[PDB]
């Protein structure tokens, strides 16, 4: 069992380090992308009503499953997989009602940097990166 929903600001720093410390804990997960390589970063299109007139970038370093570092952004971030998207977008994901792989798939999402045919091997490996993420959000602060 578990909750969250509520509060406007998801992708900070907070967050981004305790999904990426959250992992190292999911053995299952760390198991799974123990041959992924590189680093991932969740970028947000910028608009005010969630108050980011630039947008955010959130760094997800990805090490053999094992998270790496996690850094928050907001605007020109760095990353081997960079994907942009509407705010919607991403919440919806995290929800846990849509997939990271399969919204960029469909044409929801979409990767500025590094390229699809990576994400061949490690189209699974999403359920396990989602899976914690969820853990994480419950409510950090009031706001």
């Given at each position: 069992?578990?909750?969250?929903?509520?509060?406007?600001?998801?992708?900070?720093?907070?967050?981004?380090?305790?999904?990426?410390?959250?992992?190292?804990?999911?053995?299952?997960?760390?198991?799974?992308?123990?041959?992924?390589?590189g680093?991932?970063?969740?970028?947000?299109?910028?608009?005010?009503?969630?108050?980011?007139?630039?947008?955010?970038?959130?760094?997800?370093?990805?090490?053999?499953?094992?998270?790496?570092?996690?850094?928050?952004?907001?605007?020109?971030?760095?990353?081997?997989?960079?994907?942009?998207?509407?705010?919607?977008?991403?919440?919806?994901?995290?929800?846990?009602?849509?997939?990271?792989?399969?919204?960029?798939?469909?044409?929801?999402?979409?990767?500025?940097?590094?390229?699809?045919?990576?994400?061949?091997?490690?189209?699974?490996?999403?359920?396990?990166?989602?899976?914690?993420?969820?853990?994480?959000?419950?409510?950090?602060s009031?706001g």
């Open positions: 069992g578990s909750s969250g929903s509520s509060g406007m600001e998801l992708f900070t720093e907070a967050w981004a380090q305790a999904y990426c410390r959250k992992l190292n804990e999911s053995e299952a997960y760390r198991k799974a992308a123990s041959t992924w390589e680093s991932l970063a969740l970028a947000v299109r910028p608009d005010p009503k969630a108050g980011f007139p630039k947008g955010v970038a959130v760094v997800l370093d990805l090490w053999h499953g094992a998270c790496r570092g996690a850094k928050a952004v907001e605007g020109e971030a760095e990353a081997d997989f960079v994907i942009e998207a509407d705010l919607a977008t991403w919440q919806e994901v995290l929800e846990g009602r849509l997939e990271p792989l399969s919204a960029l798939m469909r044409g929801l999402l979409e990767l500025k940097k590094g390229t699809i045919a990576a994400l061949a091997p490690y189209a699974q490996a999403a359920q396990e990166l989602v899976k914690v993420a969820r853990e994480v959000a419950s409510g950090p009031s």
